[PDB]
Amino acid sequence: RDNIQGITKPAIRRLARRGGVKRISGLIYEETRGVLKVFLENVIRDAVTYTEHAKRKTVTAMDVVYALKRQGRTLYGFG
Amino acid sequence: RDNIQGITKPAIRRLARRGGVKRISGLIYEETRGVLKVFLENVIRDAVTYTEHAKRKTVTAMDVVYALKRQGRTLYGFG
Amino acid sequence: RSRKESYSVYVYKVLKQVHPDTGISSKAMGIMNSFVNDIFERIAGEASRLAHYNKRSTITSREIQTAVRLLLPGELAKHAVSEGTKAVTKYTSA
Amino acid sequence: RSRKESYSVYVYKVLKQVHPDTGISSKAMGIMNSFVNDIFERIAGEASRLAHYNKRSTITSREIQTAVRLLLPGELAKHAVSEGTKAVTKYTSA
Amino acid sequence: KPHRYRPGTVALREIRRYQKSTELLIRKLPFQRLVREIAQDFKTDLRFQSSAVMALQEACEAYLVGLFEDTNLCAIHAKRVTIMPKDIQLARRIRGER
Amino acid sequence: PHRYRPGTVALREIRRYQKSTELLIRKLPFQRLVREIAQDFKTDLRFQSSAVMALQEACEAYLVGLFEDTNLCAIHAKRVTIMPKDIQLARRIRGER
Amino acid sequence: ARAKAKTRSSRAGLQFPVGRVHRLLRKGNYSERVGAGAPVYLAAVLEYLTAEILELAGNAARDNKKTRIIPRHLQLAIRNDEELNKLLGRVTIAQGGVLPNIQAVLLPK
Amino acid sequence: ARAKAKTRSSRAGLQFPVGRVHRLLRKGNYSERVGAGAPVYLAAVLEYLTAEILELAGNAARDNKKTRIIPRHLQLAIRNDEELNKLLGRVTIAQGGVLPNIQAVLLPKCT
Amino acid sequence: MQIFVKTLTGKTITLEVEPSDTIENVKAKIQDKEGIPPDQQRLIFAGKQLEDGRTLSDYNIQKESTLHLVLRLRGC
Amino acid sequence: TVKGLSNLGNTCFFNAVMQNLSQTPVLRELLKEVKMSGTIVKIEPPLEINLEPPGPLTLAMSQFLNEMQETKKGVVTPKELFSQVCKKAVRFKGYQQQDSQELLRYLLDGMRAEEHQRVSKGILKAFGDEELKNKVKDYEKKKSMPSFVDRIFGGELTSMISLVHESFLDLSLPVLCSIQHCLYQFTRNEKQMLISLAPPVLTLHLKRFQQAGFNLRKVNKHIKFPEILDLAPFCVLYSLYGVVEHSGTMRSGHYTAYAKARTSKGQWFHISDTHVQAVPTTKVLNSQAYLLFYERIL
DNA sequence: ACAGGATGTATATATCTGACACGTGCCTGGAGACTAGGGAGTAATCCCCTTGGCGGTTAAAACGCGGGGGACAGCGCGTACGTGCGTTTAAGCGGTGCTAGAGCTGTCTACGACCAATTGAGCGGCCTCGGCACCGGGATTCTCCAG
DNA sequence: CTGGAGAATCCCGGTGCCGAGGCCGCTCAATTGGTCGTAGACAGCTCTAGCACCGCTTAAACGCACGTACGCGCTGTCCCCCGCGTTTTAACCGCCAAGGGGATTACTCCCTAGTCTCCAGGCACGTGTCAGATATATACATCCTGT
């Protein structure tokens, strides 16, 4: 565990900078990682159920992008 | 002509209070008119396209429901 | 004089099976029919899509179960999966 | 040793036709391929949907025209219907 | 001496009134006139079904109610109770229609 | 001594990161995070590098969109500093909660 | 004189039809061949979903002291359950209304 | 010794394949039968769309004075055109980035 | 056909073209006798900016015409 | 009343062109006829067609001037207008820097273009072929449609060699000292250029930019300019009401605008984006003017 | 507003370097010719539903006036967060080796489409009664004012 | 902060209305029984890629000082919106009348599926060149302090 803390303060800061944020309050570093994590169990759940239905032991880029597609978040650049 | 003004101020107030709004500014009404007009342009365009595809010039409820569905606004109660 | 089909009879039997002394409105009948049709279309589309993913040409109960897991969340999903497995087992036994 | 299928050759031909002296990255080619597949799937699904909607059994140029009008709005639809009509007219005449 | 409610109490009362009922909050004839006028821009002298216009009415009221709920949430976020139009733009952009 | 007043370096970071396209999240901790999140769904899975890269692309795009939405929300709130309340308001409006 | 025809719904102990679901899958343009268990599984899933929909609708109706299920009861039942709200968060119910809620800030103080 | 087989793409004067899209429609399980002009129409629409995308990408690359189109150029071309943005509003492109913009409030005052 | 061009300092120079020419060719002829690079070159005909990809005849430019050549200036 | 304009980060040039344009009274009345009504105009075959509503480019322009006077606040945000421009030319999308004169030219012909297009599109949609549609454009492009801008800034220039008539909207004066001296520099015989139709409002530009060989440097030399000019020898008195001043070089610069707030002479108010400052006419004459706007008086 | 210095930043030149347009050989999917079969295009018809109109009611929409509350501008203060600097730390590379399983190939068999005969279940219609809308009256409760 | 007035709301009782429930033809779609061609299950082989580790660089992450710009709290205001009484108007309901367009039925015939043959277009694989990355020295822009 504890890798959720691996999503560091500078990483969140530069993500917000790309998003266009001037300054960030200190209570947001604990919220962005939570919402990001929620997105993760939303996506990898579908990914792993695709893999399980495919009788496969590994997770493929096809499965990831296609589980993304079924959530209205289509991805280009991975087939 | 000039039927957007048929959308009455008390009707807007009733709709907003069904939405749970306490106080409504005076500037809200014309923008609600505009938003509703834009929504009608979005929906009736597809509805009339559906009708003309069948070589019939009578707009049925089925076409309206289907145009609603294709916009991610599925409606129940009309078959 | 075309004949139109709906799930009114089936949902009516289900309604008396759950609540023996409760009625249903005609307007609610159309709503239930629309709900059943929407869920049917969702599950069938997902099953066909998965069959396409796996280079598969047959829709069997496995991808039906996978589509149910995809659509229905959590408690609802696993209870529906249990019901489907029980129904399939009973059909095979019969 | 499977055989893989893509639109890369045709995309390159169109690129040479529009910009005679411009290259393209391999990554960009994959993005273009994914875009082409996505648009094709959208249009084909809409056309098949229309066919089932109108109790029809065959997809013709009219259903694809209607699907283009539904999916692409405004000037894109305006130009795309013209391109499709001129292409099908040329094909019929040839 | 006339009897007057404090500003807001009858607003809450009729909010509760309209949140418990399910009739149609827009008038049928002006709504049909608006629908026909805006449909004239696509195909000439079309004809509409009563069920079709009722479905359009249903969708219209549902969409407007949802938008009003979102804009009320935005206004309450802004530390205020009165909705001004900028809340409408905020809601419609965060939703993704603009 | 030379010293930039607060705000200008932030502006240059915004105009710089809005120009580049590389991955802003470190690949190894992101991989560890996704691997532990996949742990409770099923045991001892294997992941393709392309799959992990696609996941990271999707997560970063989603977070950038959410940050744009929350910046608009904070500006609507007549502020310049974003706060988590804007975050859950954006989530609520976008139907995510 | 072959045998008494037992419908597949009775074979699986279900009220929803199996043959009709199979026909809809076949003519619904999904696959050229459909497995035997797929219509049974789909019918069971639909029966279950309608079962809790009607159960929650009946509970809501009895809470309002009425003996008929109406779109208002259906809307209340759908929006009260979090799982069903997630399932049907993008679906509009005609003559359904909205759940009564007022934010605490708007309440008098 | 039958005839010089002219491809249907040349018959319709299209660069995109017609036989390939017809095969995809037939084997893609969208309908039991497909009309003759349907693949031609679909190929024409796809060719027009990709032509517009490539033209916009080329203009974007020229504006950035590179001779090769990359995903950044594709992203810029897609998003600066509001029509293509609406068409592909729910699409995320790898190595696409975001448009350079800053809200006017964040900008500092000047004199 | 013969059309005059006014440069930055204001002097007038005679140019020769045909209606089938494009603005790519127009600025290319400027390279030969002026040396100003195309990417800041811009010409004005009857108060209208000339889109580069179009053709001269569509702008209804006749003989003895004059073009207005200016540069782009940056200022914030 | 004069009011400030909220800069978007680099639109000081766009802010300035709005401010001096805001002091054009004649443009106010014409836009009122533009929006309403859609009167039917009949043209004999070389066609009674109603007028389409003005396009958003002319629309957002029209409402912009109403907030100049009606709105009580002293700061106005022209976000919509520049956004309307954004789709018109892709070069304005973003925060890359642009120039005052260049913005005006698309701003000007864009006004007539919607009039050029929406009128031509009106008959085509009422009557329905592509060849006919091209023919409608072909007839109009060879025709001189009396646009509203052509009735405010539209002028006709005549060049002798052989008399050739060319319409114009602005003057780009070469720079080698008064603005009149530049005016004389425009009309030497080489080949003489003379105006026969003086526009009601005159827009004049000074070419302070020039490349010394391979060196691009801005001419910082101040030019002397009066409030009144006699244009009869160049064809007439025109009163100065709008002045654009640039502060910087070809790469880095700053645009400031001067306006005449009138319903004898008065009053000049310095505009610096959101900063509004009252200034005497003498300081205006001492400003590093870049664009000149003059009004018909006789 | 101007000057100067510190500091990022675009740009030209060189030079490596790896991605790319081109050439080659091979394979199967596309094209062509022929044949059958059924799906929709056309036309006529039958009649269900839409449009349109008209007239009377009354409840909703407009208008208006007072007044109160809250949106907004302004001021002050305290804190927290951006900016910079010195000290880790581990992310990355690259280089190595290992093996798990993903994909391909070949057999084989259970199964789902198919056709023909049989039949009964739901659909449309046609009654019949209990849920419910409506109207009126009494109990309940929230508000609002004064004290 | 604690009580009456009053007005809106809700529950209850009687009444008439009609929409939901039960019952009756009947027809099409479900069922049943053989039959066959095929798609999918299964075992084995391979070799691709994920896994894991180990050692070295250094840029990124981290912790801390500060001080300043921002968020928040308080206050005044005055202007906009809510609550209410009058008056008007058109939405709504009820009913009538036409006809116009939607839904079938018959026929066909023309378009598309299917099969076989032929081969040329598309794809995997080497391959030398040119666009891009990197280094570095620039001129240049921008911000900060001082005045």
Chain D 41-60 residues in 7 Å CB range of strand L = 58, 60
With helix as H, strand as E and coil as C, how does J21-33 read? HHCCHHHHHHHHH
How far is the CA of J204 from the CAs of A34, B39, F34, J11, J149, in angstroms?
60, 47, 65, 21, 15
CB distance H32–G30 less than 8 Å? no
Chain B: closest CA distance from residue E94 (Å): 15
J260: which DSSP letter? E
Q: Which of E94, F22, J44 is nearest to H71 (CA)?
A: F22
Task: Quote the tokens at residue J209.
Answer: 């930019």
Q: Do C53 and A47 touch, CB atoms closer than 8 A? A: no
> Is A79 part of any domain?
no
Q: For this structure, is J12 an active site residue? A: yes
Tokens 């696509």, located at residue: E42
Q: For residue C52, what is the nearest residue in chain G, using CA coordinates?
A: G31
Block residue for tokens 């031609």: H40
Compute, in degrees rounded to 10, the torsion defined by CA atoms J142, J147, J151, J156: -20
With CB atoms and an 8 Å threshold, state whether G100 touches E72.
no
Interatomic CA distance for residues J12 and J103, integer angstroms: 12
Which residues in chain C have Cβ-Cβ distances shorter than 8 Å to B78? 30, 34
DSSP assignment of H36-98 equals: SHHHHHHHHHHHHHHHHHHHHHHHHHHHTT-SEE-HHHHHHHHHHSHHHHHHTTTEEETT---
Query: For J250, what's the count of Cα atoms within 13 Å in the CB-facing half-sphere?
Result: 14
CATH number of the domain to which G14 belongs? 1.10.20.10
Q: Which nucleotides of L are covered by protein (CB under 7 A)?
A: 6-10, 19-21, 28-33, 39-41, 49-51, 60-62, 67-72, 80-85, 90-93, 101-105, 111-113, 119-124, 131-132, 140-145
Residue G13 covered by a domain = yes
C-alpha J210/C-alpha J223 separation (Å) is 16
Paired with D59 in beta bridges are H34
User: What is the rounded CA–CA span in Å between residue F64 and residue F71?
Assistant: 10
Burial of I50 (0-12, 13-18, 19+ CB in 10 A): middle
- Whether residue J37 has a cis bond before it, omega within 30° of 0: yes
Chain-chain contact of A36 with F48 (C-beta, under 8 angstroms): no
Answer whether A touches F (≥3 Cβ pairs < 8 Å): yes
Adjacent-strand bridge partners of J245: J256, J289
d(CA G18, CA G10): 9
Q: Which domain holds residue B42?
A: 4-70
J23 preceded by a cis bond (ω within 30 of 0): no
Distance CA I5, CA F14 (A): 44
- Nearest-CA distance from C1 to chain G in Å? 21
**For chain E, where are the E strands, in sequence order?**
47-48, 82-83
For J98, other C-beta atoms within 10 Å of its C-beta total 21
- φ, ψ of residue I48 in degrees (nearest 5): -110, 135
Nearest to H90 among A19, A22, A73 (CB): A73
E79 nearest nucleotide via C1' and CA: K71
List the domain range (segments joined by +) for residue H77: 8-87
Distance CA B46, CA D73 (A): 10
Assign domain J4-296 to its CATH architecture: Alpha-Beta Complex (3.90)
Query: Residue G107: inside a domain, yes or no?
Result: no
Q: What residues contact H14, with CB distance under 8 A and at least 6 apart?
A: D87, H40, H43, H44, H47
C-beta of residue B24 within 8 angstroms of C-beta of residue E82: yes
Residues in D closer than 8 angstroms to H73, CB to CB, are 28
Q: Output the six-digit token pair for A29.
A: 């570093």
**List of domains in chain D:** 7-92 (1.10.20.10)
A61 beta carbon to strand L: under 7 Å: no
Nucleotide nearest the Cα atom of G24 (by C1')? L29
In a domain, B43, yes or no: yes
Cβ neighbours of J38 (radius 10 Å): 14
CB contact under 8 A, H82 and J87: yes
In a domain, H104, yes or no: no
F and I adjacent (3 or more CB pairs under 8 angstroms): no
Calculate the CA F28 to chain-centre distance: 17
Domain count, chain H: 1
Chain H residue numbers touching D60 (CB-CB < 8 A): 35, 37-38
Distance CA H68, CA H66 (A): 6
Residue that is written with structure tokens 């993500």 in the block: A15
Q: Tell me which H or E stretch contains D18.
A: helix D8-18
Largest separation between any pair of C-alpha atoms in chain F: 57
SS3 call for J122: helix
Q: Domain E9-95 belongs to what topology? A: Histone, subunit A (1.10.20)
Q: Give residue numbers after which chain F breaks (C–N above 2.5 Å).
A: none
Q: Report the C-alpha gap between A5 and E82 in whole angstroms.
A: 41
Residue found by looking up tokens 């249907």 in the block: H8
- Nearest-angstrom CA–CA distance, J114 and J51: 12
User: Residue A15, class by beta-carbon neighbours within 10 Å (0-12 exposed, 13-18 middle, 19+ buried)?
Assistant: buried
Instruction: Give helix then strand counts, H and E, for chain I.
Output: 1, 5
- Judged by DSSP in three states, G68 sits in strand
User: What is the resolution in angstroms?
Assistant: 3.0
SS3 J229: strand
Beta bridge partner(s), residue B75: G92
DSSP class of residue I18? -
CA J79 remoteness from chain centre? 19
State how far the Cα of J268 lies from the Cα of C36, in Å rounded to an integer: 74
State the helix-helix crossing angle for J130-141 and J100-127, rounded to 10 degrees: 130
E96 interface with F at CB cutoff 8 Å: yes
| B36: CATH | 1.10.20.10
Contact at 8 Å (CB) between J283 and J233?
A: no
- Could you tell me which of D62, C52, D54 has the C-alpha nearest to residue H42? D62
CATH T-level fold of F8-94: Histone, subunit A (1.10.20)
Task: Flag whether residue C34 sits within 8 Å of chain B, measured between CB atoms.
Answer: yes
* B32: in domain: yes
DSSP state of G103: -
Locate the DSSP E strands across chain J: 4-5, 75-76, 155-160, 163-168, 171-173, 192-197, 201-206, 209-212, 215-218, 228-230, 237-248, 253-260, 268-272, 275-278, 289-296
Range of the domain at I37: 2-70
Half-sphere exposure of H84 (CA within 13 A, CB side): 20
Contact flag, residue C60 CB and nucleic strand L, below 7 A: yes
The residue type of E96 is G
- Chain I: partners with 3+ C-beta pairs within 8 Å: J
Cβ of B57 near strand L (under 7 Å)? The reply is yes
Q: Which helix (H) or strand (E) holds B38?
A: helix B28-53
According to DSSP H, which parts of F1-97 are helical?
A: 8-17, 27-37, 49-76, 84-93
Quick one: which of G17, A48, G32, G35 has its CA closest to C61? Answer: G35
* Residue J198, both tokens: 């003086």
Q: Is B79 in the C-facing interface, judged by CB distances under 8 Å?
A: yes
C-alpha C35/C-alpha G88 separation (Å) is 9
Partners of H30 on chain G (C-beta within 8 Å) are 29
C8 nearest nt, CA–C1': K122
Partners of residue H34 on adjacent β-strands: D59
CA J51 to chain centre: 25
The first and second tokens of residue B43, run together, are: 């929906």
CA distance H100 to H96: 12
* Other CB atoms within 10 A of residue F74 CB: 26
10 Å CB burial of residue J188 (0-12, 13-18, 19+) is exposed
Give the HSE-up count for residue I32: Cα atoms under 13 Å, Cβ half-sphere: 10
Indicate the burial class of J170 (C-beta count within 10 angstroms; 0-12, 13-18, 19 or more).
Answer: buried
> What are E4's two structure tokens?
């007057």
Which residues does J251 contact at the CB level (< 8 Å), separation at least 6? Answer: I74
Q: Six-digit token pair at B28?
A: 């809200």
Based on the residue annotation, tell me whether J254 is a catalytic residue of this protein: yes
Q: Is residue A36 exposed (0-12), middle (13-18) or buried (19+ Cβ within 10 Å)?
A: buried
**Which of B17, E42, F14, C79 shows the shortest CA–CA distance to A21?**
F14
Please give the DSSP secondary-structure letter assigned to residue J41.
B
CA gap G84, G52 in Å, rounded: 10
- DSSP per-residue string spanning C27-56: HHHHHHHHHHHHHHHHHHHHHHHHHHHTT-
Two structure tokens written together for F54: 């696609």
Kindly give the interhelix angle for C26-53 and A29-53, rounded to the nearest 10 degrees: 70
Phi-psi region of D28 (alpha: psi -120 to 50; beta: other; left: phi over 0): alpha
In three-state secondary structure terms, I43 is strand
Options J12, J182, J246, J270, the catalytic residue: J12
CA G60 to chain centre: 15
User: CA–C1' distance A3–K7 (Å)?
Assistant: 37
- Between chains, do C53 and A49 touch, taking CB under 8 Å as contact? no
Whether I75 is covered by a domain: the verdict is no
Contact between residue D80 and residue H43 where contact means Cβ atoms under 8 Å apart: no
> Distance from D44 to chain H by nearest Cα, in Å?
7
Q: Which residue in this structure is represented by tokens 């913009």?
A: H101
Cα–Cα distance measured from residue J186 to residue J171, given in angstroms and rounded to the nearest whole number: 9
* CB nearest to H95's CB, from F7, F21, F68: F21
CB A44 within 8 A of CB F20: no
Structural domains of chain A, count: 1
Nucleotide K90 C1' to residue F31 CA (A) = 15
Elucidated via: cryo-EM
- Give, in Å, how far the C1' of L66 lies from the CA of F9: 17
Which of these, A39, A40, A63, lies nearest to A51 by C-alpha position? A63
Catalytic residue among J165, J181, J254, J275: J254
Q: Do A19 and F65 touch (CB under 8 A)?
A: yes
Question: Exposure of G2 by Cβ count < 10 A (0-12 exposed, 13-18 middle, 19+ buried)?
Answer: exposed
Instruction: Please give the radius of gyration of chain D, using alpha carbons only, rounded to the nearest integer.
Output: 16
Instruction: Measure Cα distances from D1 to C52, G85, J101 in Å.
Output: 21, 48, 63
CA–CA dist I51, I17 (Å, integer): 17
The strand pairing partners of I6, in sequence order, are I12, I68
- How far apart, in whole angstroms, are the C-alpha atoms of residue F44 and residue A58? 9
Chain K: bases < 7 Å from a protein Cβ: 1-2, 5-9, 19-21, 28-33, 39-41, 49-51, 60-62, 67-72, 80-85, 90-92, 100-105, 111-113, 119-124, 130-132, 142-145
CA of A22 to C1' of K80 (A): 15
Long-range contacts at H50-55 (CB < 8 A, ≥ 24 apart): H50/D11, H50/D14, H50/D32, H50/D35, H50/D36, H50/H16, H51/D14, H51/D17, H51/D18, H52/D76, H52/H84, H53/D32, H53/D35, H53/H77, H53/H78, H53/H84, H54/D11, H54/D14, H54/D15, H54/D18, H54/D19, H54/D32, H55/D18, H55/D19
Chain A contact set for F64 (CB, 8 A): 15, 18-19
Tracing tokens 């396009």 back to the chain, one arrives at J55
The gap from C-alpha G100 to its chain's centroid, in whole angstroms, comes to 23
CATH code (residue I14):
3.10.20.90
Classify burial at E86, counting beta carbons within 10 Å of its beta carbon; exposed 0-12, middle 13-18, buried 19 or more. middle
C83 burial (CB, 10 Å; 0-12 / 13-18 / 19+) is: buried
Give the nearest nucleotide to F78, CA to C1': L71
Strands I42-45 and I66-70: antiparallel
- Give how far the C-alpha of residue I5 lies from the chain's centroid of Cα atoms, to the nearest Å: 7
Distance CA J207, CA I71 (A): 9
Would you say I35 and I65 are in contact if contact means Cβ atoms under 8 Å apart?
Answer: no
- CB D57: neighbour CB atoms within 10 A? 11
Q: Which nucleotide is nearest to D1 (CA to C1')?
A: K104
Partner-chain residue, chosen from D30, D33, D38, that has the shortest CB–CB distance to A74: D38
| CA angle H20–H26–H32, rounded 5-degree value | 165
Strand L–CB F1 distance below 7 A: no
**Chains contacting chain F through 3 or more C-beta pairs under 8 A:** A, E, H
J71: nearest Cα among J133, J6, J125, J123: J6
Beta bridge partners of J240: J294
